[PDB]
Symmetry: C5
Subunit: 92 residues, 5 copies
């Protein structure tokens, strides 16, 4: 049974934790409100791993369909104001 999953990161709310046997991570997208500075999203333990770098006037968003993450997973907006959205599916 797969359920749709999503989150929004920003400078005000820089972190989000998924914490169902696997998180299927599909896309990462900038919101229309996001400033122009490069954005960077990392996954934190339990060093950080950078999974995406995006910029409004250069690369709207990115697809990474196929990535499957083992929970718990913490995302952090390591650089930029956001909003930055993430989409995916929980599967078990």
């Amino acid at each position: 049974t797969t359920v749709l999953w999503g989150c929004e990161l920003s400078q005000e709310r820089r972190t989000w934790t998924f914490r169902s046997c696997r998180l299927l991570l599909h896309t990462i997208c900038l919101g229309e409100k996001a400033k122009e500075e490069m954005h960077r999203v990392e996954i934190l333990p339990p060093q950080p791993v950078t999974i995406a770098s995006l910029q409004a006037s250069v690369l709207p968003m990115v697809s990474m369909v196929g990535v499957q993450l083992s929970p718990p997973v913490t995302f952090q907006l390591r650089a930029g104001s956001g909003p930055v959205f993430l989409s995916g599916q929980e599967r078990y």
Copy 2:
């Protein structure tokens, strides 16, 4: 098994798929779409926040290909930001 497609816009920013599995392939801006960024969401089914699946803009990225996304119906797409047209393609399986 069956090809699927839908165009979202200011006139129609919402669409819902019902019949097993929507394979979602690409999302593309139309040549008549104006400059502004466009954002496409999937709404949660009624039973917390819409899930953003694509951000596109004509001068910087006019489409994206997310082959491998497989959605269970009903699925409601919404054109959250932008006037469109924005197209969606995929297959009903």
Copy 3:
């Protein structure tokens, strides 16, 4: 086997026929000769069209959609732009 086609304002359509009961669609690419306007490629019904790609020379000259499998007959149409636009795939 390997399969490809070129669409243009002169030749706007290109129908695939004959295993070869599956067309794997891999990439869609603008030619270096395509002019600056946005290009849109749709797939047409046998007997509403579905847009599968939007491209523009100065913004995004190609796209990969490896994984799409289509059931023949498939008719592609260059709905907008003058081309050339190329498609590639693998008859399966």
Copy 4:
């Protein structure tokens, strides 16, 4: 068996042929030394598989395409260099 595979195309070497199995093709990338013109890469029996340009799209990923050898790539337009990467399987 799997072995990493790569080749480089350019005006000085327009084509490259892989043969003695499937070639898993991964990415196609412009070199930093490349010029600014649009580059187009074909597979010759031609089928165009990529268009790239340094100031617009310097590479593309094609993880999933599997080719039956022999396979000949051609730099149909542009001066290069253009790199291809993949994996020989079996």
Copy 5:
């Protein structure tokens, strides 16, 4: 058993080798840091045979790429062939 993997390449560390029944490095994304300057970056894999180029990125053009589905057999040596970075690689160690 799968574990998240991530490395950072730069002028400082312009080469990293992932060393070892079985294990595959699943290679997911390669992304420029916001601190990378304007030059083109190119990342190779060096034979444990010439180097193989796997990505070309540039901040003002294409700051990252996804290559989900690439499964590398160790040993795998990554090299930042052109560019000062930082450039980040992400993936998972499987099995």
